[PDB]
Symmetry: D3
Subunit: 329 residues, 6 copies
């Protein structure tokens, strides 16, 4: 139990939506010795320091594009959770190199620093937009995922495990659509912005995502891309829920947007393993030191999937009606 | 036209490179053709086979911005073909592929803007459409950078476009030559990854010609996609070696069963022409562009809402016998 | 005037930034206003609140010279407001503050010279005068770099000036909003560092207006200091929360009891005008400048040999009630 | 006693005024195993190698702006004395970035290299021009001081202590005013250059500064800014001493110059601790591992100072007349 | 015997002429645990992986100009053979900075990475064009040689030995003249290109060079520049051998070419030591830890040479007639 | 002529530097002379000894490209004299010598091209001919870079030439001053490395004058070699100290017994003039050059097939007494 006692954890992008919730979770449910937040903004860090005001907290101002800073910050760290990223799809289309520097080079630097400091386990956050991506954001995350999975080939004086957690949209994420609509409805709610009527997405709550990352830590061998089984919801039903008696307005598909998202590509189903409530996409490459991904560290058994499996949000077997959504807010 | 123009091609010693250089020397009045690549061996050999005063060779890496800045001085047109393209090797050396393909694209763009290059065409691949392998992901990032670079507006406008096509019949390190080696080496079996494998096929000459036409058509920002045939890998092996049997070696790291050239999710951005497609930019530039009409006054039209250019459902299929005519 | 001019502001999403952008959009004919900062969240929100075609947003870091070189293309005026400004946090993250504030200044200067920007104004702080904290030391280095940059003489002359003023009432992450939060959160006590604490106070609108006038006055090389009121911190808390009592939390890392805007040791360099001061450069440029007469033909005069603009002995004091009118 | 036996010491800027005197002191009064000089100029190093010709000496050509070079040079070092710097006030005003690169980035690199090589103790030289600075030189030194003090927060496999020594003008320093006047008087001595008649400064001899650094090593805990109690002298009395019957000439205040210098800012008196013949300005920040700066490693007791203490050169309690100066030359 | 058992070896430029032969030699004649090829080209590495198809092989795509990549690749390595280089003399004259970056900075990076990873022994390949060089290629190799020899001064937690192997032209080297003529004779053989009639060179076979490097590993102390005793051949006799009845054509001396090559400069004879079939040019500098280069690790005794010794290819005591050459091909 | 020209000299505070600056100030109408070097001490002293408005001092390192890019703005002529030249120390600090001499050359070239400098002359040494020591190897690399840089063809053509000569009598840190120190220090013995030691000798004024003439003659690409006398080291010590005896300390790390200025293997590239030699480039530039005729219409002729300019077989020998006249 509690396989995280007296551990020092560092989370890049710790001031974000996932970050604050993750930090709260670790402080409340684990015996972790220290939690280090690594991010660039002094404003968000100053406010987070006040909000949490916990002696087990440490704040480092730093950029994941800065290898030297990461090298210094990861000293004495046991576990690294990599959540830092530029995630705005349309903005990434207009500022591709910035997204590339943060998401791709950021991954490379975090990996490098974790190896140098002999971190034990590392989990990087992916996204469904990284599966058969069409937008730059997703492309950078795919590169990131490939880097983290591949990093398990290294063999230093100390062993470091690198795994990835991939899930869909986070309900109420910082700068996401949910908060956007709630605000529009709060102001006047005259007409709700709708990209396309066919728009569908996977949905997971902040708590579910955070808990999934934590459990992934407990069962990972290193090299896995963990995918949780989650519900899908149509953007039209989402709007009516956040504003019952309010007219919608089609604004058109934004730059680099998909109508439906994928979490486990059809072309990679042969690498996928199913479990009670989650999947594991095995590495496409072979490590010098093989591993059995069918049995987690929690002794959970997994089975291969069908030769034509495709985990998409358009044909999901589970959904959420406007009433199920409200039960989250 | 390339009349009295100076053209530089990164990765000029490769399969596409040598064919492109030959075509430019023989069919245009380009004043100077610069080859930019790392290997002194290939450049020494290419200088011998292309002993032409119009040629100039620069040893250089696309990961080296200062070197590119120097080499692109006085250049009018830049063709970006340098890349790490072996899918399996990119899976094992992801950062190397990222440095060459992604940072290389960034450096070329930067050097082209600095030297006020007029037109730039970067080579893309169908592996960059809804990619699953690292190589394809790096090319998608490359494509996004080149398209985005059109937002720049310096003293001299620079146009950046992309050319995306499928597998090049018999390219350096590809399957075709590999199968020819086995056949000529008296192999008793032909290694087949998966019986369902399908691919688009374009000849080296077709690719080069398409790139040259793109130069004449481009406004900057387009991803040009040629209409080319597909071919089941089973048929290809059955043609290059009808006798010898085939063994199943299994799908290699990062491979797709079928390739996409125009994703369904990007249908709305596609414009169809008689012999090709243009995938319009997903972003809006400072100055609008009308991609429905090429610089050659060719008119294009939107495709069907459910359209997708895939190799598994292509209306054009390369005949196993007609393939031998290409070899 | 900013008539048909292109202006770029680093740290454009901050308190000064948004107020500056609004003022330029509403009171000038600037053709384009570029916001350059790192956060996609703030830029996405600012784009929504400033849905104006005159706006352009660039995601970028001032620690990134290549990014600045690109973003400043075609820019006429650059306002440098990007910085790490939290005094206590800079003490704990000194190198981070040094990278942003000092190297950031160096990169902006470099990019401005490369792109032949006409005028540049960098924001300074009174914490940079006879500094004791790391933040102030980095701003002093920044100020020195900007003043020194005027020695350059390229194809296009670039003027670099500095604007130095005190605490901005209610700036992002400052005390005022913090006290408002407590008051509206039903706090039973107001945290006071030291009963002797004194500070200069300027409103966001006053700061922005002063920067705009500096642009019209500057020859390049000046450090502009506005004549603004001082205010005992005790009075400020007594105004924002007359009821609730105040607790003494003690002086924070790197704090001064009173701030200086014009050091006594720099008196001889100061020139007084009706509404402001100019601290002349301590160095002599290749081409002399007469700071006694602004570009607006305003005449200034030397100050007293023992002069020093401090917040503890200011002849102007902000009335605790008059402060509420600013809030 | 002799807490420096069999130790390897590296001094950046070892060919300078402080450097040569410091090296001579260590070689003559300690059982140090080896002394490494780290500086850029081959001429000064070649001449110093001949002048000292001591087998315990090692010379490395290198720049403190060069992290890789520092990383290599500090290998196997136990103690690092950082004296390298651009110190010409007016020149720093004209070449601010150069002063910044050497003094600030130089400090960052030395710190980085000392941590990587597990150096035991490090002392960086500050200056009174770093207290409430007005000139760029002083500003860079203040940044340097802040970096060295802050570096004590790190906790690697090995512990490194970082302290700072701050004192006034060094009599006869390389390129300073004393040598300047002596030369003018040697040539013809027609008229002595005087910036301002009110000019006052703190004065310490090369030997006193060097000895102070050495003793600071013996009593430091890491994090301190050591300040020695030293005399003050008016520039007018200084001139008459270096040229009794010679007329002076007011040339005016040079770029970035103060009339009087400060060593312990009034605003930091609350951090200051007084001792028999020196002060300790405690860190403004709190380290994860607290320390008691009231009792040195030499068991010397210190007391807090008055709430309005201000160690300035204009109101010093001790001075030096033209006769006291001559007793130094 | 077999002083290389269970060792991990990394060879930069492993896909080249020397590289493939060296790898074949190690795999066939030693008990080495693993051999890592480090080079840039994916094509050559893909083909070499197929050609060798040995489980003891590992391939890393990487540039010696890339320190971070080298740092990563050399992890866990015991022996490093540095063969990567730009070696085309005329091309180096036209692309001097490229040759400098690869050969000089490449050497610096390899040295740096080997020290960081505590490699035991390192051998860099030199060339006779590095002795009293006139062309840029040779100048860069001379710099490289100086760097490797000098690197023996370092003293880390682990000791690393750095030696250099210098020999003449390799018969049939990739892109060399032999393959060139064979091709011309294969096509039509109308006229053979001849730079100058006086042209002479030292000649060693691929196998001899590779074996020499291996034996050098077994007898090196670190700091040596090993030179093998090899035959000399006139370019005219070389041509007649590769094409008996074919007319030659004088094309003139190419950029940066010598008529005759030197392997042991007259001015360094005082540092040279002779052995049965090889020489050792001792370091020009003195290491903190002296070494006796007169007795190898194989107990082979060496004697100083004459005060006017000059190992040139024009006055060699051994040569190869067109018949001796054919006995190599 | 240097009429109204701006000249920058790297390593301007050195022996060659100060002599060059004095000569330019006194014999030309150069409008501005910029000294670029690292040491504030030497620059402060040089500014005092050269208190002339035509002078300008930049603190900077040739290893710093950005600093060079800035300092060379508006410069017409660049003289590159910065270097690490102590042979023994370069052997012990090889990478340091490589960074300064080789990368320094690369940066100067890069900055000169960027700022469109008209002419550049880099100082070489006879130790760079058939070198055995690291120092000489770095200078050979430097020479190769400068010659090669002439292939560039930007908006403004930049000519790069090299000046190679022997030991400079009494240069900073050289033997002569060292022997003078001993003699004036009442030394009982003079350290001699080897009784066979021979060297070429040129005075500081001769070197400076030759550099100035090279500027007037150069087409770009030449390595200029002056005809100067040789001198046995035994004679030099016998002149500076006839009384005191000499001890044999042995050959120092990296020393040659005799120096070469023009290698036999480069004979075919040499052109002889009345007072000097030109070693033509080993490479062919985009645009040919006729080195047989200088810009001063001086005609040169090829040398003998077996020619080699060495110090051991020089037809000119410095008289031990005639040397004292130089001292
Ligand atoms: N051949 C000869 O006559 C002699 C040569 N030598 C030396 O011996 C060594 C081997 O020579 P040889 O086998 O003939 O030459 P090759 O050109 O056949 O091999 C050179 C190898 O170096 C690799 N390489 C080149 N640049 C780099 C780089 N920047 N980073 C990593 N790898 C690089 C190349 O692989 P890739 O391009 O895929 O990176 C290639 O595998 C060289 O150092 C050469 O100087 C000395 C004496 C005799």
């Amino acid at each position: 139990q509690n396989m995280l006692d007296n551990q020092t954890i560092l989370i890049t992008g710790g001031t974000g939506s996932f970050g604050k919730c993750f930090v709260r979770k670790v402080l409340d449910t684990t015996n972790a010795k220290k939690i280090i937040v690594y991010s660039r903004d002094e404003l968000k860090q100053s406010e987070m320091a006040m909000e949490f005001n916990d002696p087990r907290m440490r704040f480092f101002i730093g950029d994941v594009r800065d290898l030297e800073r990461l090298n210094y910050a990861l000293e004495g760290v046991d576990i690294c959770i990599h959540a830092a990223a530029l995630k705005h799809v349309p903005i990434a289309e207009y500022n591709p190199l910035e997204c590339i520097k943060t998401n791709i080079m950021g991954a490379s630097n975090v990996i490098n620093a974790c190896l140098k400091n002999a971190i034990s386990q590392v989990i990087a956050l992916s996204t469904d937009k990284a599966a058969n991506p069409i937008n730059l954001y997703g492309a950078t995350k795919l590169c990131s995922d490939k880097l983290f999975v591949s990093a398990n080939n290294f063999k230093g004086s100390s062993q470091t495990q690198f795994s990835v957690v991939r899930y869909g949209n986070v309900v109420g994420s910082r700068g996401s659509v949910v908060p956007f609509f709630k605000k529009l409805v709060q102001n006047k709610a005259s007409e709700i912005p709708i990209t396309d009527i066919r728009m569908t997405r996977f949905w997971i709550t902040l708590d579910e995502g955070v808990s999934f990352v934590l459990k992934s830590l407990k069962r990972m061998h290193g090299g896995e891309i963990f995918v949780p089984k989650i519900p899908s919801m149509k953007m039209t039903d989402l709007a009516k829920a956040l504003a019952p008696n309010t007219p919608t307005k089609i604004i058109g598909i934004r730059p680099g947007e998909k109508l439906h998202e994928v979490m486990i590509p059809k072309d990679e189903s042969h690498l996928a393993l199913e479990f009670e409530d989650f999947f594991i996409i095995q590495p496409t490459i072979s490590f010098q030191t093989p591993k059995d991904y069918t049995l987690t560290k929690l002794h959970e058994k997994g089975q291969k999937v069908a030769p034509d499996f495709e985990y998409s949000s358009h044909n999901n077997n589970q959904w959420l009606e406007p009433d199920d959504l409200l039960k989250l807010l």
